[PDB]
Design a protein around this ligand. Sequence first.
Ligand SMILES: Cc1ncc(COP(=O)(O)O)c(C/N=C(\CNc2ccccc2O)C(=O)O)c1O
Ligand SMILES: Cc1ncc(COP(=O)(O)O)c(C/N=C(\CNc2ccccc2O)C(=O)O)c1O
Ligand SMILES: [Cl-]
Ligand SMILES: [Cl-]
Ligand SMILES: [Cl-]
Ligand SMILES: [Cl-]
Ligand SMILES: [Cl-]
Ligand SMILES: [Cl-]
Ligand SMILES: [Cl-]
Ligand SMILES: [Cl-]
Ligand SMILES: [Cl-]
Ligand SMILES: [Cl-]
Ligand SMILES: [Cl-]
Ligand SMILES: [Cl-]
Ligand SMILES: [Cl-]
Ligand SMILES: [Cl-]
Ligand SMILES: [Cl-]
Ligand SMILES: [Cl-]
Ligand SMILES: [Cl-]
Ligand SMILES: [Cl-]
Ligand SMILES: [Cl-]
Ligand SMILES: [Cl-]
Ligand SMILES: [Cl-]
Ligand SMILES: [Cl-]
Ligand SMILES: [Cl-]
Ligand SMILES: [Cl-]
Ligand SMILES: [Cl-]
Ligand SMILES: [Cl-]
Ligand SMILES: [Cl-]
Ligand SMILES: [Cl-]
Ligand SMILES: [Cl-]
Ligand SMILES: [Cl-]
Ligand SMILES: [Cl-]
Ligand SMILES: [Cl-]
Ligand SMILES: [Cs+]
Ligand SMILES: [Cs+]
Ligand SMILES: [Cs+]
Ligand SMILES: [Cs+]
Ligand SMILES: [Cs+]
Lengths: 253, 253, 395, 395
Amino acid sequence: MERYENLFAQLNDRREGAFVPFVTLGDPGIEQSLKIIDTLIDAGADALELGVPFSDPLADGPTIQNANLRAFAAGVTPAQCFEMLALIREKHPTIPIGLLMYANLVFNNGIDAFYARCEQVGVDSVLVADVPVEESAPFRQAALRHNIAPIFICPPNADDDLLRQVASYGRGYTYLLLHHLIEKLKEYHAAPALQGFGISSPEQVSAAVRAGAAGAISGSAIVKIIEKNLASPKQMLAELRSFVSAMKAASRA
Amino acid sequence: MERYENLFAQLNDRREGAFVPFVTLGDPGIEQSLKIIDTLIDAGADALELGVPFSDPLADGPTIQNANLRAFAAGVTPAQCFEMLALIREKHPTIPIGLLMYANLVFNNGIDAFYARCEQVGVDSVLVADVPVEESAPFRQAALRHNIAPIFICPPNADDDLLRQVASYGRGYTYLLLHHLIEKLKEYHAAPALQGFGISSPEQVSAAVRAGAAGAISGSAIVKIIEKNLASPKQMLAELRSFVSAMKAASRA
Amino acid sequence: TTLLNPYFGEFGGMYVPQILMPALNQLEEAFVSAQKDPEFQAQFADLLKNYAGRPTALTKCQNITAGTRTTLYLKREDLLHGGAHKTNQVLGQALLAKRMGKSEIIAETGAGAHGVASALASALLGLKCRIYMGAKDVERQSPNVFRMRLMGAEVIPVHSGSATLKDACNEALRDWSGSYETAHYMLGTAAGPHPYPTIVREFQRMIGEETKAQILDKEGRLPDAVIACVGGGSNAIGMFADFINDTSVGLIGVEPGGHGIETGEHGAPLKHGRVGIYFGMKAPMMQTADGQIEESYSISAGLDFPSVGPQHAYLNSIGRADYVSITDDEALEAFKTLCRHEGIIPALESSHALAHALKMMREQPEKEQLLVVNLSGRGDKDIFTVHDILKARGE
Amino acid sequence: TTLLNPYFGEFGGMYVPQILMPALNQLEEAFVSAQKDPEFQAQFADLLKNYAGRPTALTKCQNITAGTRTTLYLKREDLLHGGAHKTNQVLGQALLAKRMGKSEIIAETGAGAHGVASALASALLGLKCRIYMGAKDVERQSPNVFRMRLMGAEVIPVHSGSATLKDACNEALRDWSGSYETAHYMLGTAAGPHPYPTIVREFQRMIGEETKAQILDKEGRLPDAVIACVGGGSNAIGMFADFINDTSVGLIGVEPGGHGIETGEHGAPLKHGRVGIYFGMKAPMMQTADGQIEESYSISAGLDFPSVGPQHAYLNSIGRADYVSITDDEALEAFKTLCRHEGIIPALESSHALAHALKMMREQPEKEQLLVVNLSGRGDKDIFTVHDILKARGE
Ligand SMILES: Cc1ncc(COP(=O)(O)O)c(C/N=C(\CNc2ccccc2O)C(=O)O)c1O
Ligand SMILES: Cc1ncc(COP(=O)(O)O)c(C/N=C(\CNc2ccccc2O)C(=O)O)c1O
Ligand SMILES: [Cl-]
Ligand SMILES: [Cl-]
Ligand SMILES: [Cl-]
Ligand SMILES: [Cl-]
Ligand SMILES: [Cl-]
Ligand SMILES: [Cl-]
Ligand SMILES: [Cl-]
Ligand SMILES: [Cl-]
Ligand SMILES: [Cl-]
Ligand SMILES: [Cl-]
Ligand SMILES: [Cl-]
Ligand SMILES: [Cl-]
Ligand SMILES: [Cl-]
Ligand SMILES: [Cl-]
Ligand SMILES: [Cl-]
Ligand SMILES: [Cl-]
Ligand SMILES: [Cl-]
Ligand SMILES: [Cl-]
Ligand SMILES: [Cl-]
Ligand SMILES: [Cl-]
Ligand SMILES: [Cl-]
Ligand SMILES: [Cl-]
Ligand SMILES: [Cl-]
Ligand SMILES: [Cl-]
Ligand SMILES: [Cl-]
Ligand SMILES: [Cl-]
Ligand SMILES: [Cl-]
Ligand SMILES: [Cl-]
Ligand SMILES: [Cl-]
Ligand SMILES: [Cl-]
Ligand SMILES: [Cl-]
Ligand SMILES: [Cl-]
Ligand SMILES: [Cs+]
Ligand SMILES: [Cs+]
Ligand SMILES: [Cs+]
Ligand SMILES: [Cs+]
Ligand SMILES: [Cs+]
């Protein structure tokens, strides 16, 4: 499928930035998670980045650490996550769905088999948080053989050799984290860049798009809202909707 | 004075052994101690061996260790002991009175001065428990200059060189602890020998006299009786009297 | 791109977020540089000798092998300053941090020996040290916590995950990613992402080098086997390294069997786990069927880790080293035996190695064998634990 | 009659009941014999090296003397097997007992380090060890009590007198008088009746011998002063002995000042007591006006003894050695300072010596001086005591 490419094409023709939220699958439970996700989409999410709960999330700060706790506390397993993903795609045919994974969960039952399952349920991309480009070969190979975009992080400490590698190896979009980076990425024909650097307000989205990025990823601010409204599932959704709408508004200009 | 010599002369003319009890001065209090001592004499004690309470009695087992505790618990001091000794001698002009001392109490205010005070109150001998013959010179000198007999222990591990030294240096009586010892002591013209080796029954006294000793010292059995009858001062005296009489009986034959 | 091979056969690698890769590359370059620098080597040797006390004794233990044809020596890392082998490599890593111009130290610890070694090295060398320690460990290691603090270290409790060593390990890595321009991560075992398995081995290899020289002096030949416990792998690889090319010398690593392998409550991933990716390395893991990292178990806190360094996994795979397990009860007996019969109180970690050597002797008592056990640490820290057990079991 | 002089000027002697004199004469003869016996010397050297870990490091402490003209080295007896200098002389005494055909060991301890050293030596060498310890000490030294018992020693509590070290000392002597055909009394300091002050010195003298060789190697000259704490006198005389004839080298002994000399709660008899006779020797004592032996006091259990070995009293009298005191608070500061700035946790006993050296430096910071402090032991045993104080004083 060409979900990312189609999205970017539509956004480029509407002179529009992407806004992409992250949430943890099954936080704070499976049913509520499904409803959370439907609220994100209904409120203007251009794409999703979805985490699978893992015992040892090395790249995550406390916000998402606690999201994982909440999910485990509900007994959420990877197989249950794949069930959810299938249900999500069945409801929403065009929205790009990316996973944020830890390597062991991809490697566990075989790398090829993991990516094959992603393709079966209609996932579009996989970012493996603890696999640098240096170790990425078997992951990006399996991803591409199963029509999944392998997503790479371009960090703020990147160099030119890294920029060429990310540009060459990545698909769907480049996960950013400046104009040196954005222009070199384009020069190197990298997948369109999404800024993901602590983006938690509408201006950030605007500022990202202006710098020449294709959009912005809100890797944490969403789970904060989940976190603050646990006792009030109803209000949770309202705040989620409110936030996403604002963020999405900022991308039309 | 010649208290020991006079005693032995009288006992030799009555074909009679000496019996000598030990008690701790001021155990379990000054007044009761004075009464205890008067009971020992009235019951047939030939002489006395009197301890002065000391912080660290190296040569004493638990029986006498506890005697010291009892005395200290009553606030008994060396000066108070010298007061008692004066009162004892004032009541009893002929009975030999020996002290069992620890070296520090003799050395404390000057060795000469200690012995001078012994002479003033009418003490006849001093055994210093932690001074071997090898270290005894200043003690036996001061003792003799003040008409006090220095008493030496002849242990069960003694040799012939030690027997000559004890014989030469000791006066009053030799503190024994066999026939090799007793006869060598006499051969070497030692002070008459008293057996002090765990003597706690009338037979022991008999057996001592038969071996050729001049008598026996009951270094502990007396304090046991004090110990058993603390709650009953009256009965204490009765048992004391009973015991001493028995012991003393055994020395007439 | 690296200067040195990050892998031992299939095992090892650099499985960290991209952001940490410059830190690892920097460290590797500084290490390669330092290893060629006689001035660095002199400095390191000076600290090992005059501060830590090397060389350590090699003690022949006659009473415990009486009536058998086993001769047993103990390599006395229990006598090193700090009370365990951990001190050796912290001194080298502390110098590396300085060489890199770093002024702060991060270190994980569970039991606490590495934390204490990290703190003492930091006190001596003027680095600001923070120790991440699972809250669960902080609770149980008040003594070591206080030693660290006396030595000016900040102890940071970790409540994430299962609030233990693994999570402590995770926390240290998280911090380092954001602070590596100022802070060095002083990893405390021969595991994690390259170049740590390599650095830690090279900065522990004097154990085996000294052992070899000492056994040649005393016995005129190499040992039949050298035996070491395996928590993450540092003391064992330190003992093994200089013997790898001596093919006659057996290399025996001892993982904790816990309440028994069949109970699942152990810390023996090399032989009873399966390969996964965690803590920046591809290595045997204790993991759930689903690929979550399991909690390990051992009476000995120092061995209670659900993975193992990649060089050990490799040496096993090619048959160069053999790995066994020793249960809590076996380790405890070895602990009591050494106290009673040699007057040495061993760490419960080290007691696992001792227990396996005693098994080699007892199972075949007329077999002629010259053994060396790496006595990785002293067991003062364990006397309460052992007391509580002996009292509860009724001795 | 003796083979060697029992006195150091006026101090020393053999103030024991006659019954113990053959035991002392026997021991003296066995010692004189052993000292001439290359086989005994080889055996002793073997144990010191391969079991205990000698030679010990000499560590230069740069951080704590920064900005002054003091150069300070620490002699690292804290690294000896057992964690204190006590281990040296127990190994020699244990061999003496064997040479005499004795199969049992008696030893006094308060703090517990000597007891542990006695127990470990007994475990190694196949002697049956009983430790007398004032009940008061047993109560406060549960850890050391358990180490001793783990090592197979019988700990016997002493309730007589004040139920402490002195009474423990008394108890050991009482037992020995009746058992000396089978048992050796392993006295744990350079005091008591001859020949103990002599034997203990000679079996501790390697401390000073090594120090001398180490300081010549590193500095090319002898130290200006060597500084050691004084409990009964063993670690100090072990450091001093090889320097006595080097008249330029200052010999500084540090007694515990407790809450302050003027409070009377201290353990500084050499300078603030008066000569008496106790524990088989003529030596300075803390004593009442009446001549009863006083209770001493120090925050440090190892220094809490109301007397001192006779060689120290003698060296003071002729002006060869100088003796000072250090209070509890001074010792505590030195303890904290060494932990923080050198990464070494010293025994609180040893902290008294360190505190005096720090005073020498701070009082005259432009005075050029090369100092050695005998760091007699490590301070793991003290971490609770220090914790409780720092918490109660509010740090
Ligand atoms: C005396 C002694 N003997 C052996 C070991 C086992 O560790 P090894 O020699 O490295 O295999 C230890 C390990 N102790 C740990 C664990 N250290 C640790 C273990 C695993 C991952 C990270 C770690 O910091 C500590 O934190 O001090 C030890 O103290
Ligand atoms: C580390 C350390 N550093 C210094 C000292 C001071 O003792 P010193 O070096 O002999 O002066 C000790 C003394 N410790 C005692 C006291 N030992 C003791 C003291 C006095 C009389 C009998 C004794 O058994 C013990 O019982 O272990 C110590 O442990
Ligand atoms: Cl991420
Ligand atoms: Cl591309
Ligand atoms: Cl007596
Ligand atoms: Cl005569
Ligand atoms: Cl090198
Ligand atoms: Cl080199
Ligand atoms: Cl055995
Ligand atoms: Cl502190
Ligand atoms: Cl802090
Ligand atoms: Cl963190
Ligand atoms: Cl070589
Ligand atoms: Cl040989
Ligand atoms: Cl072999
Ligand atoms: Cl082999
Ligand atoms: Cl498995
Ligand atoms: Cl092989
Ligand atoms: Cl086997
Ligand atoms: Cl064989
Ligand atoms: Cl010699
Ligand atoms: Cl010789
Ligand atoms: Cl300072
Ligand atoms: Cl036990
Ligand atoms: Cl017993
Ligand atoms: Cl006793
Ligand atoms: Cl020489
Ligand atoms: Cl020089
Ligand atoms: Cl000088
Ligand atoms: Cl001088
Ligand atoms: Cl005084
Ligand atoms: Cl002089
Ligand atoms: Cl001064
Ligand atoms: Cl000067
Ligand atoms: Cs050494
Ligand atoms: Cs053997
Ligand atoms: Cs392990
Ligand atoms: Cs200096
Ligand atoms: Cs003292």
